[PDB]
């Protein structure tokens, strides 16, 4: 009966809870009680790029740590060169409402999407010298919140409806569809080995999925409200998420529970973007009170503050070589800090 | 700098010129966000897979209209995209009284329309935007109140079963849902199927909001 199935599900959830409790011995904050603190670290703004004329939603660093892509509140997909500040490309979008961007590791393609409900794939290296619409992937029912490139032929998208999709580029068909969520999926992150990926939705739960098999492996809970940004550790064995509770949370994949909580009493605004530093000693979190904070990943004390913005930070990223961190906010400017 | 770097600089300058020209062109366009109780009166207001845009023009002014009734998701996670709209159009059907249980749950259309209006016109983001609320079903209402009185809702008195005070009570009850009576205004226009003066009303409202914004900008309001 339905009541019997519900009771069995509750018993299974209690079983998961007691297994997680049994697997735990101590706390990560307890073990890292003899490691010297990072002290105080002070970045400064080395470049400022001011080409946009509206709010900036998404950004993504290239694989060469020299190029940037940014999406605005108009037909404005701008590809910048960071070192010399000259802007390389300007792409006009058919739909002015965008919320996501991604740069392919091959440096050939860029993905855009938003409230327009379809994911547009643009190619940059063509004979005619312009930028053309390579593909227009369709099939979702709600708005796209994040899109990432697996390779030059596989793309993974998370939509407003409780679904995730892995696509095919030559023929625009969903090769695989993931349906396990109850609530809008807001963030998506990919593993270093391009075999697993983590999705974060509006129901305060983070789900880890297998790319090829097509079924979920683990579900983590603990957040008070919806989560908006998820980032992988460089190792691939841990991940940190940010929510609207003014708290960030670091979970581990193998132990299947939470490890650290980053939160302070003064800050009450939400978190819009989260990224990790190389070697995973720092955690950069963009808050809604026009700031951008830096936390020590091994112990919860707070390091320097990157306060240079006049509006809320909407995106932030760290290069593959770990040189500089680039933050874009709702004011048209975005900055590079070193 | 080498020759190639100089040419790259020139390319950046040209792209900047084009971007500035496009932004200046796009700045002279007022935006209206259209909301309604599904298929209530929106189709008529538009007659004269995601969101759908309309690009009508009138009297040396370019209008851009967004219809987002096809989203069917959590509206609190994307409403902030529309923070800079010039105005909000709200469509409510006057025939919505009786005709109860249109939604799956047992409640009148009118109460859910009121709930939507209260959600929109007291939102955190829309603290300085006006509403151009339309009332769509003007001549079905006469027959409905002829055949059936106002009893299924509004426990308070409606006066009588004539169109005048019935419409007056409906408009008064809708116009007082808002709390910030100073920072925003409601226009409360009635409309019928054969009316051909809706765009004039929208033009007047838009001009009023533009004048108010200009006065507030120069430090005089």
């Amino acid at each position, epitope marked *: 009966e339905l009541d019997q199935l519900r009771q069995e599900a509750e018993q299974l959830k209690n079983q998961i809870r007691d297994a997680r409790k049994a697997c735990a011995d101590a706390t990560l904050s307890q073990i890292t009680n003899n490691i010297d603190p990072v002290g105080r670290i002070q970045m400064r703004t080395r470049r400022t790029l001011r080409g946009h004329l509206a709010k900036i939603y998404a950004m993504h660093w290239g694989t060469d740590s*020299r*190029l940037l892509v940014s999406a605005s509140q108009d037909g404005k997909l701008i590809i910048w*060169d960071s070192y010399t500040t*000259n802007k*390389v*490309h300007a792409i006009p979008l058919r739909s002015s409402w965008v919320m996501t961007c991604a740069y392919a590791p091959s440096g050939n393609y860029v993905a855009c999407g938003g409230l327009d409900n379809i994911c547009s794939i643009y190619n940059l290296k063509t*004979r*005619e*010298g*312009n930028v053309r619409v390579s593909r227009e992937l369709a099939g979702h029912t709600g708005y796209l919140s994040c899109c990432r490139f697996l390779d030059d032929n596989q793309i993974v998208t998370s939509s407003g409806d409780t679904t995730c999709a892995l696509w095919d580029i030559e023929t625009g068909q969903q090769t695989t569809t993931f349906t396990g969520h109850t609530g809008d999926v807001m963030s998506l992150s990919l593993a270093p080995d391009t075999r697993l990926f983590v999705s974060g939705a509006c129901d305060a739960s983070a789900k880890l999925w297998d790319v090829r098999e097509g079924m979920c492996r683990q579900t983590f809970t603990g957040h008070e409200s919806d989560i908006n940004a998820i980032c992988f550790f460089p190792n691939g064995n841990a991940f940190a998420t940010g929510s609207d509770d003014a708290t960030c949370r670091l979970f581990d994949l193998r132990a299947d529970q939470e490890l650290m909580t980053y939160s302070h009493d003064n800050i009450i605004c939400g978190i819009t973007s989260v990224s990790f530093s190389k070697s995973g000693r720092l955690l950069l979190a963009g808050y809604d009170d026009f700031n951008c904070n830096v936390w020590d990943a091994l112990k919860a004390d707070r390091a320097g503050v990157l306060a240079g913005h006049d509006n809320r930070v909407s995106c932030l990223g760290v290069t593959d070589d770990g040189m500089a961190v680039a933050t874009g906010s709702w004011d048209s400017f975005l900055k590079i800090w070193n | 700098l*080498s*020759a*190639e*770097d*100089k*040419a*790259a600089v*020139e*390319r950046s300058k*040209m792209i900047d010129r084009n971007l500035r020209e496009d932004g200046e062109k796009a700045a002279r366009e007022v935006k209206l966000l259209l909301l309604g109780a599904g298929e209530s009166g929106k189709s008529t207001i538009v007659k004269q897979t995601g969101i759908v845009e309309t690009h009508f023009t009138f009297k040396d002014l370019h209008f851009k209209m967004f219809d987002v009734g096809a989203q069917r998701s959590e509206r609190k996670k994307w409403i902030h995209c529309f923070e800079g709209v010039t105005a909000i159009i709200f469509c409510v059907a006057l025939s919505d009284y009786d005709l109860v249980l249109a939604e799956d749950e047992e409640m009148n259309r009118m109460h859910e329309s009121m709930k939507l209006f209260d959600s929109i016109c007291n939102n955190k983001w829309f603290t300085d935007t006006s509403i151009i609320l339309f009332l769509n079903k003007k001549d079905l209402f006469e027959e409905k109140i002829k055949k059936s009185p106002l009893t299924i809702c509004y426990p308070e008195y409606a006066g009588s079963n004539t169109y005048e005070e019935a419409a007056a009570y409906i408009q008064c009850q809708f116009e007082d849902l808002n709390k910030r009576k100073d920072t925003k205004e409601i226009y409360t226009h009635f409309t019928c199927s054969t009316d051909t003066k809706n765009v004039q009303f929208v033009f007047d409202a838009v001009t009023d909001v533009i004048i108010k914004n200009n006065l507030k900008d120069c430090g005089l309001f």
Partner: single-chain antibody, 231 residues
Framework: VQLVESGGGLVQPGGSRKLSCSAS????????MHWVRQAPEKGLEWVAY????????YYADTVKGRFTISRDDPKNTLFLQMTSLRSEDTAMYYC??????????????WGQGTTLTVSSDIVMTQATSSVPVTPGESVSISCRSS???????????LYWFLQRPGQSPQLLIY???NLASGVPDRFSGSGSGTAFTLTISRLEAEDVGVYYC?????????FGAGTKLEL
């Protein structure tokens, strides 16, 4: 990706001429243009450069004042104008497209060119003038520059062009290390300041002609004498 030329022919001294280039198949407004002259039995030499948007115009030291070059965008045409025509210019002209941004490959496509007959600066040295060869071997060609072409930004500026018999040249290596598009992986380039080597491994047919090394550090463009390979 199709450029055509017209207006050439036989002229008398003191006349004026109008050479026209028509483009089809790409975005003209984003591509700058070059005019490069080739003598009937000598090497390449540059004539003129126009940038995108008609902002910067450069002429050679032996053509300034006489020559005048413009372009019309809506009709997609490129005009060059000849005044006080003399006996030193009897040669055949080429138009070259080029775009400049990070990762670009200037001097990508070359038109056929047209013939016209009548009735300091960095010097590039080509070591050799003729090298017989047989298929299945490896060939190294050396090109020397008077001053170092390695700019302070870590970027080197040398372009290798190949001219097969009866055919407009094509790009082989740009910036001394980068392979062009549509070219096999056999070719390679290396060297250092004031010394450059082009290496070909596993020679095959359709590989005879002349090879040219060009600098791009500062105007005017200077090429080499020309190195040939024969079967």
């Amino acid at each position: 990706v199709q450029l055509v030329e017209s207006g050439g022919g036989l002229v008398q001294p003191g006349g004026s001429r109008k050479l026209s280039c028509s483009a089809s198949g790409f975005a003209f407004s984003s591509f700058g243009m070059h005019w490069v002259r080739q003598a009937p039995e000598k090497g390449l030499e540059w004539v003129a450069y126009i940038s995108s948007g008609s902002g910067t115009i450069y002429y050679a030291d032996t053509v300034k004042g006489r020559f005048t070059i413009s372009r019309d965008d809506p009709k997609n045409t490129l005009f060059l104008q000849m005044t006080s025509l003399r006996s030193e210019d009897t040669a055949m002209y080429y138009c070259v497209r080029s775009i400049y941004y990070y990762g670009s490959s200037p001097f990508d496509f070359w038109g056929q060119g047209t013939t016209l007959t009548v009735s300091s600066d960095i010097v590039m040295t080509q070591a050799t003038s003729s090298v017989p060869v047989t298929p299945g071997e490896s060939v190294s060609i050396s090109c020397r520059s008077s001053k170092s072409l390695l700019h302070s930004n870590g970027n080197t500026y040398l372009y290798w062009f190949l001219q097969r018999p009866g055919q407009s040249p094509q790009l082989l290596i740009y910036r001394m290390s980068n392979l062009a598009s549509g070219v096999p992986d056999r070719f390679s380039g290396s060297g250092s300041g004031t010394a450059f080597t082009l290496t070909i491994s596993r020679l095959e047919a359709e590989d005879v002609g002349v090879y040219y090394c060009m600098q791009h550090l500062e105007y005017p463009l200077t090429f080499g004498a020309g190195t040939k390979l024969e079967l």
